[PDB]
Design a protein around this ligand. Structure first.
Ligand SMILES: [Zn+2]
Ligand SMILES: [Zn+2]
Ligand SMILES: [Zn+2]
Length: 20
């Protein structure tokens, strides 16, 4: 069982890193 909130938080982290 994967956790959609974990994945969503990491995906958000990736988008955020791409802003730099
Ligand atoms: Zn699983
Ligand atoms: Zn949660
Ligand atoms: Zn949640």
């Amino acid at each position: 069982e994967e956790d959609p909130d974990l994945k969503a938080a990491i995906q958000e982290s990736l988008r955020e890193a791409e802003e730099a």
